[PDB]
Design a protein around this ligand. Structure first.
Ligand SMILES: Cc1cc2nc3c(=O)[nH]c(=O)nc-3n(C[C@H](O)[C@H](O)[C@H](O)COP(=O)(O)OP(=O)(O)OC[C@H]3O[C@@H](n4cnc5c(N)ncnc54)[C@H](O)[C@@H]3O)c2cc1C
Ligand SMILES: Cc1cc2nc3c(=O)[nH]c(=O)nc-3n(C[C@H](O)[C@H](O)[C@H](O)COP(=O)(O)OP(=O)(O)OC[C@H]3O[C@@H](n4cnc5c(N)ncnc54)[C@H](O)[C@@H]3O)c2cc1C
Ligand SMILES: CCC/C=C/C/C=C/CCCCCCCC(=O)O[C@H](COC(=O)CCCCCCCCCCCCCC)COP(=O)(O)OCCN
Ligand SMILES: CCC/C=C/C/C=C/CCCCCCCC(=O)O[C@H](COC(=O)CCCCCCCCCCCCCC)COP(=O)(O)OCCN
Ligand SMILES: NCCc1ccc(O)c(O)c1
Ligand SMILES: NCCc1ccc(O)c(O)c1
Lengths: 425, 425
């Protein structure tokens, strides 16, 4: 019997389990997989033997992510500034300029006006109240309709759409405008900031921080899949797939939102949460690492291709590199290499694709999705509650962070909040 | 005896007198000077014999100025697109980029945030209510204080300040923030638009339109200075400096705001207007035409110099040009050529000043100022009323336009409005 059982060994669970430990509590961390880190997954490249790649969460920005920064400072984890872009190869039409900010002057007045509308709209969201408690329904519509209302000329329109596709992991017709404004809000009410937060990387991968953190957790069970969390008795009983149950005064669910439906909760969770939990969020982010020949360093491409963005990731040799493409799994099949060639050649006709590397987050039973993105209409029905305690069971993780959802920083923030709650209750 | 006496032969009076005429009214136009056009003043250059220069109002933009556009269309007056800028020589510090929009990326987030604040603030102004009827007092503070609140990094801060100086004709400490926001509002709620409205010029000078218009006015008295307007009787009596009085059912005052205090009105004007009329507005715009050698075509300079802006105006020969500088008459003495050399050399150290040409609008008794700019605190006390009828006497002109003050378009709009009022009353 434990003071707390933490279910899930991504950053959320790891921080929770460690902080509770250091506070003097008796803590058990249960991880379903064979590794720690969750959606922060560094490993050897499938294409380049010996090369260590981030297959999920990679980037941070110290100004926007103070908790993460403090983790890095705590353990002396080195960070390098992310791959700089010297070469611009956009597909935004003939009037675009080949630089990082490709808007031409002919569009400046329009961009000015949209910047006001977007920020006005984002200034409606208060980041503590929850997206369902602020009469924001009018905004919770498909992104494409919202962007059609803005009436943007071609370059800025497509530029906005491409990054929106990248960041949200959803085509414009499935993405919620409200959620886009939520990301704008989370970045100190900045549209620009949403892209400028790709500022830094882990010099040796996320696993450095994963290991530094796990060092301080005395009890961890890998390969342990929780299937039931039962709080009907005086002490919470946690049921596991293959073996003896575990019990604790408190349980922290630190698993991905889309996996919650695979656990039996007793009693059943508060009913307002149930339909969203059953359908899952709509995130379909697809990140592909593309092994290439013939690409010069520092390329960045944004445009109207099936890869909204494609840019430099890593140097492999003097002739070979890794590029990264973002798109979504409903729109693109990464196992279709011809398709990948076409998507790449569209921006970079001189570039030869050697191979691809990715992780199928959706098909992974321990995840059932990459980062969170709500379906249209979801989060104006229920959002804040999803991360609220139901009795003695707490819910944490990037997925339910109000402050920085979809980012490592969000995983850390929700954890902090659960820890403090437990240290009083 | 006339249906109407129009006092002043700038664009305002000219349109009024013509439209009233064409409506079948019996109209007399009284002009104090020896020319028509007022602050739209084309003439021979003082520096370059044979060269025709705009010494006042020169630029327009068809999208922002529909009335002016229709005048030009009516008379087939040719317009050329204004001098294009190929060369940028800013004094905005070492991080500025030498292009028309000199903001660097390091400042983009800050500019984004200020753009929201500025436009939010400008969106408070409704362009029909008058700046004194909307609880805008909080904004009617010195521009420098308002801009200090925005907390802008060096390039965008100085860039904003320099154009504000240019457009308002006042140093930051004397200019009202409210008035700046008013200009933003007038340009379809665009900061950018305030500078992009320098779009076109009269191919042969403003006098073309002045003449086309005056052709259609059958009675005009030049060298006729009105000194009194007396409406105590049944018919308005207009007193003139040297000679017999004139009378009419209606009088349109179409003279510059700052000259109104030199006329005796009977009865005295409504008392709320009196103190502003006595002090005059604070406009001190100084436009200097600088004859130069050693300047290549297409130069534009913006910066922190005593000339906030200095840019290409006219080609004189293969070695000689005219540049134009804007500043204000309280800050700079244009008769001091050494000073002019220093101001120019500051941006363009290779450029030799041959001579200068300007008009002293403030010292001209028929004007007592260039374009309107209120003193801090003036227009939130009284603004809309200044252009409102006092009995049978109407007040028109750029100075009192709510829609486009300081522009020819404003002169046209106020006139239209007086004409319609008279055609009913
Ligand atoms: C492609 C991609 C790119 C990203 N890039 C960035 C980025 O650049 N910057 C950034 O900040 N973030 C990025 N992220 C987001 C970030 O990686 C995650 O949002 C964050 O790591 C979430 O961590 P977590 O602790 O909330 O949950 P997770 O990391 O998902 O951890 C959940 C853990 O629970 C375990 N689990 C699941 N089911 C059970 C079960 N029933 N029983 C026991 N254990 C179970 C899982 O194995 C997993 O270890 C990216 C994400 C993806 C998918
Ligand atoms: C330096 C400068 C640059 C400018 N640049 C531009 C520009 O680029 N674009 C733009 O749109 N506008 C510009 N303007 C503004 C524009 O020129 C004026 O605001 C506009 O022409 C005002 O015209 P008006 O009809 O209101 O009055 P005015 O043009 O001033 O006409 C008033 C008339 O009344 C006469 N008068 C004065 N007192 C008496 C009296 N007591 N009795 C009889 N008659 C009298 C004067 O002689 C004058 O003819 C500029 C102005 C200046 C000063
Ligand atoms: C009353 C005071 C008013 C203050 C005025 C300050 C603003 C004046 C700006 C005037 C510059 C206009 C130039 C436009 C660009 C251009 O033509 O030059 C272009 C390049 O310009 C650009 O990079 C486009 C920039 C788009 C920015 C839009 C953001 C709006 C934010 C508003 C700015 C806020 C002001 C600062 C506080 C030439 O290549 P292109 O044609 O192939 O592309
Ligand atoms: C959730 C969806 C989010 C949508 C994201 C769209 C916006 C992403 C923009 C990311 C580009 C950042 C690059 C910044 C410039 C840079 O570093 O590159 C600079 C040059 O860039 C510039 O010209 C500065 C432009 C300033 C513009 C400010 C206006 C803000 C308006 C917001 C834009 C609205 C989006 C369109 C609808 C390199 O020379 P420098 O360092 O010597 O100068
Ligand atoms: N909700 C944003 C999650 C995210 C994080 C990193 C990325 O590179 C990305 O495209 C999207
Ligand atoms: N109130 C703006 C009046 C104005 C008009 C033309 C100019 O060139 C200028 O600097 C200012």
């Amino acid at each position: 019997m434990y003071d707390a059982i933490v279910v899930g060994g991504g950053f959320s669970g790891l921080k929770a389990a460690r902080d509770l430990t250091n506070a003097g509590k008796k803590v058990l961390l249960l991880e379903g997989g064979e590794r720690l880190g969750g959606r922060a997954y560094s490993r050897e490249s499938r294409n380049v033997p010996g090369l260590r790649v981030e297959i999920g969460g990679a980037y941070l920005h110290r100004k926007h992510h103070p908790r993460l920064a403090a983790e890095l400072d705590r353990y002396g984890i080195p960070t390098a500034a992310a791959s700089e872009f010297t070469s611009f190869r956009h597909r935004l039409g003939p009037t675009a300029v080949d630089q990082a900010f490709p808007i031409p002057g002919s569009e400046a007045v329009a961009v000015e006006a949209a910047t006001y509308t977007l920020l006005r709209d984002a200034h409606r969201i208060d980041l503590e109240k929850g997206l369902e408690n602020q009469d924001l329904e009018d905004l919770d519509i498909p992104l494409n309709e919202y962007v059609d209302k803005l009436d943007l000329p071609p370059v800025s329109r497509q530029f906005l759409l491409a990054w929106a596709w990248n960041m949200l992991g959803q085509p414009a017709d499935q993405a919620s405008a409200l959620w886009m404004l939520q990301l704008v809000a989370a970045h100190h009410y900045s549209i620009l900031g949403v892209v400028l937060s790709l500022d830094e990387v882990f010099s040796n991968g996320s696993a450095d921080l994963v290991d530094a953190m796990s060092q301080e957790i005395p009890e961890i069970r890998l390969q342990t899949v929780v299937t039931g969390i039962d709080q009907s008795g005086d002490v919470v009983n946690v049921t596991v797939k293959d073996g003896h149950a575990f019990q604790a005064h408190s349980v922290i669910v630190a698993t991905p939102m889309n996996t919650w439906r695979r656990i039996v909760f007793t009693p059943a969770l508060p009913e307002r949460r149930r339909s969203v939990i059953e359908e899952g969020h709509g995130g379909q982010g697809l990140k592909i690492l593309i092994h290439v020949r013939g690409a010069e360093a520092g390329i960045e491409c944004v445009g109207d291709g099936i890869f909204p963005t494609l840019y430099d990731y890593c140097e492999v040799s003097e002739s070979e590199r890794l590029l990264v493409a973002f798109t979504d799994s409903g729109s693109f099949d990464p196992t279709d290499i011809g398709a990948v060639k076409d998507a790449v050649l569209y921006y970079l006709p001189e570039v030869e694709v050697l191979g691809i590397d990715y992780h199928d987050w959706i098909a992974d039973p321990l995840f059932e999705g990459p980062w969170v993105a709500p379906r249209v209409g979801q989060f104006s029905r229920v959002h804040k509650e999803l991360g609220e305690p139901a009795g003695r069971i707490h819910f944490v993780g990037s997925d339910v962070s109000l402050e920085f959802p979809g980012y490592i920083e969000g995983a850390l923030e929700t954890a902090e909040c659960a820890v403090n709650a437990i240290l009083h209750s």
